Swiss-Prot record, chain A:
Oligomeric complex that consists of at least the alpha, beta, beta', gamma, delta, epsilon and zeta subunits. One of its GO terms (cellular component) is Golgi membrane. Gene3D superfamilies: Tetratricopeptide repeat domain. It comes from Mus musculus. It is a peripheral membrane protein. SUPFAM superfamilies: TPR-like. This is Coatomer subunit epsilon. Phosphorylated by PKA. Polyubiquitinated by RCHY1 in the presence of androgen, leading to proteasomal degradation. It is found in: Cytoplasm; Golgi apparatus membrane; Cytoplasmic vesicle, COPI-coated vesicle membrane. The modification Phosphoserine is found at S29, S83.
UniProtKB/Swiss-Prot annotation, chain B:
It comes from the Eukaryota. It comes from Mus musculus. It is found in: Cytoplasm; Golgi apparatus membrane; Cytoplasmic vesicle, COPI-coated vesicle membrane. The modification Phosphoserine is found at S281. This is Coatomer subunit alpha. Coiled coil: none annotated. Oligomeric complex that consists of at least the alpha, beta, beta', gamma, delta, epsilon and zeta subunits. Interacts with SCYL1. Interacts with JAGN1. Interacts with TMEM41B. Interacts with SVEP1. Probably interacts with PEX11A. The coatomer is a cytosolic protein complex that binds to dilysine motifs and reversibly associates with Golgi non-clathrin-coated vesicles, which further mediate biosynthetic protein transport from the ER, via the Golgi up to the trans Golgi network. Coatomer complex is required for budding from Golgi membranes, and is essential for the retrograde Golgi-to-ER transport of dilysine-tagged proteins. Xenin stimulates exocrine pancreatic secretion. It inhibits pentagastrin-stimulated secretion of acid, to induce exocrine pancreatic secretion and to affect small and large intestinal motility. In the gut, xenin interacts with the neurotensin receptor. Signal peptide: none annotated. The chain holds residues 913 to 1224 of 1224 of the full protein. The modification Omega-N-methylarginine is found at R53.
């Protein structure tokens, strides 16, 4: 696979690396060229550079790109989403085409955000690709059906044990499993970071593994390193808040990270949940509180 | 399937566990039954703070929603079924904070001290305690907090009341005397005794003053204070006598009404805060505890449930 580096960089989480390499790579095939562009834009989406994707991908572009763009608009425009899903539903039902894997993944992604796990899973079921399998496992884990997840993992495991995508998948299942497994997950994350490069994604994964186990202090270094690279990184800040409390840092510290998160991303679901909790708490207070 | 947070809720009675889970309503209920906590409002910061720490996050795939991890204190043994949230707050932490409270009391920062004390007191129910004795310490820790809170709060008021009437003065001395009873550490206990002695001296209730002086000396205050105390004591001896009768019985056991700051002798009916142990006169029952601020005075409760040891089968 010529694209191997580009894709691999993408999965690990080093988007810029993916973008840089994608450009360097030569097409050598109308097919490959399309795949390259798909990843290139996918990388931009990870970066959250929606405008880049929306502007550059134009109607004349290949259908694979179109799917990517579809996802991009979904992420970019909140208003557009219901309309997009409706169309997605229509396209999904009124059209058989399984072959376009990219379409399935993008479509599944939209459903995933839509929180229609069934639809996303339904779509993924059709897709053959290894990535489809990985995405499938991830959805199952969110579903909290580890058992189903395990089956898919082995499914991919038989196909390609060594693939990084498979390894990441195993780590995920692993993290979910708990127990001795956690160490296994830790090593895979560590190995990837060592081989490829510490990515924010990889660092947090390692931290999560350590945190799952008692080792709060060990976690400090990875988070600290991650924070240094990108302040405002959502996973990092959240982990820091959790880590800070275990460490016994001053309560202000936990608060500071939390506030920092709001600055970086007002929208972030973690923030929304936090707000939601505040609301019901007030609601509950009234319930218990004495009347006057 | 079943979410890990839910598993935690099913698994543990402890309120902190539920808060970590995010099950506020459940947690509040537990606090309501186990302890009196009617008024949750002072709790809000604790809940959100506790809640924030509950789960970690990592990203499975790019451009997808991030995953959440739920750490378990019994990670090794806990299967999918028997997980329980990691700790995060411990008894030692609370105990350590206590020193700061002591420091503030000495400085005279009483109002701030009350806040720190109350903060700790409220936090006690949050703890997960490993062993039986450790449970006792927690209870003891709570007791210390209320003792200071009621005592300090009484003191703040006493200063506020007017000096002018003789009756007003008798009131002040009485309150000062009540403080004497509070079970504080010797550094503080000495300080209060020192104050009471002066008030009683001016009151010309020398006989009572002498007793305070003797108690103070036993504590072993600094030498300057001790010398001063001896001086006052000798003066009192010249005319051992109390000019006025006060509503204070050094010998008879007391219980200070947290609200009224009036003595409740031995057997006399009292209503107590389920959580703090603060005492109130029967009138108060059903009202929000001044000390705790969260609890209901009258409420009957299961009792604090910090550790799983408490549950038996």
């Amino acid at each position: 696979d010529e694209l191997f580096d580009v894709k691999n960089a993408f999965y690990i989480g080093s988007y810029q690396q993916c973008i840089n390499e994608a450009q360097r790579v030569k097409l050598s095939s109308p097919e490959r060229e399309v795949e390259r562009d798909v990843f290139l834009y996918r990388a931009y989406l990870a970066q959250r550079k929606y405008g880049v994707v929306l502007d550059e991908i134009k109607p004349s572009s290949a259908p694979e790109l179109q799917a990517v763009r579809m996802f991009a608009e979904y992420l970019a425009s909140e208003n557009q989403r219901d309309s997009i899903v409706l169309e997605l539903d229509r396209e999904m039902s009124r059209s058989v085409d399984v072959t376009n894997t990219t379409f399935l993944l993008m479509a599944a992604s939209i459903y995933f955000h839509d929180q229609n796990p069934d639809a996303a899973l339904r779509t993924l079921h059709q897709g053959d690709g290894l990535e489809c399998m990985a995405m499938t496992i991830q959805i199952l884990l969110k579903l909290d059906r580890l058992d189903l997840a395990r089956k898919e993992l082995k499914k991919m495991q038989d196909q390609d044990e060594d693939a990084t995508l498979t390894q990441l998948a195993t780590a995920w299942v692993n993290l979910a499993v708990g127990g001795e497994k956690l160490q296994e997950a830790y090593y895979i994350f560590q190995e990837l970071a060592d081989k490829c490069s510490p990515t924010l994604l990889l660092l947090n994964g390692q931290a999560a593994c350590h945190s799952a186990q008692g080792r709060w202090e060990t976690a400090e270094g990875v988070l600290q390193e991650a924070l240094d690279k990108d302040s405002g990184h959502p996973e990092t800040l959240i982990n820091l808040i959790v880590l800070s409390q275990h460490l016994g840092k001053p309560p202000e510290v936990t608060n500071r990270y939390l506030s920092q998160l709001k600055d970086a991303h007002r929208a972030h679901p973690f923030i929304k949940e936090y707000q939601a909790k505040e609301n019901d708490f007030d609601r509950l207070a009234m319930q218990y509180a004495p009347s006057a | 399937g079943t979410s890990p947070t839910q598993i935690w809720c099913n698994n543990s009675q402890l309120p902190v566990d539920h808060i970590l889970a995010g099950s506020f309503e459940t947690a509040m209920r537990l606090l309501h039954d186990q302890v009196g906590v009617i008024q949750f409002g002072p709790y809000k910061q604790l809940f959100l703070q506790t809640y924030a720490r509950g789960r970690t996050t990592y990203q499975a795939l790019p451009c997808l929603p991030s995953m959440y991890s739920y750490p378990n204190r019994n990670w090794k043994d806990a299967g999918l079924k028997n997980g329980v949230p990691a700790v995060g707050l411990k008894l030692n932490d609370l105990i350590q904070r206590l020193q700061l409270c002591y420091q503030l009391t000495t400085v005279g920062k009483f109002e701030e001290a009350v806040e720190k004390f109350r903060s700790i007191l409220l936090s006690v129910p949050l703890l997960v305690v490993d062993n039986k004795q450790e449970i006792a310490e927690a209870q003891q820790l709570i007791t210390i907090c209320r003792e200071y809170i009621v005592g300090l709060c009484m003191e703040i008021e006493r200063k506020k009341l007017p000096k002018e009437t003789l009756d007003q003065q008798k009131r002040i001395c009485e309150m000062a005397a009540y403080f004497t009873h509070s079970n504080l550490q010797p550094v503080h206990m000495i300080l209060v005794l020192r104050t009471a002695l002066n008030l009683f001296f001016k009151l010309k209730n020398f006989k009572t003053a002498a007793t305070f002086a003797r108690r103070l000396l036993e504590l072993g205050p600094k030498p300057e204070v001790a010398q001063q105390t001896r001086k006052i004591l000798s003066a009192c001896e010249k005319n051992p006598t109390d000019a006025c009768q006060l509503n204070y019985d050094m010998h008879n056991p007391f219980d200070i009404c947290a609200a009224s700051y009036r003595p409740i002798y031995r057997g006399k009916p009292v209503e107590k805060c389920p959580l703090s142990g603060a005492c109130y006169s029967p009138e108060f029952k059903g009202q929000i505890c001044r000390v705790t601020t969260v609890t209901e005075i009258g409420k009957d409760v299961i009792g604090l449930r910090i550790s799983p040891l408490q549950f038996r089968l």
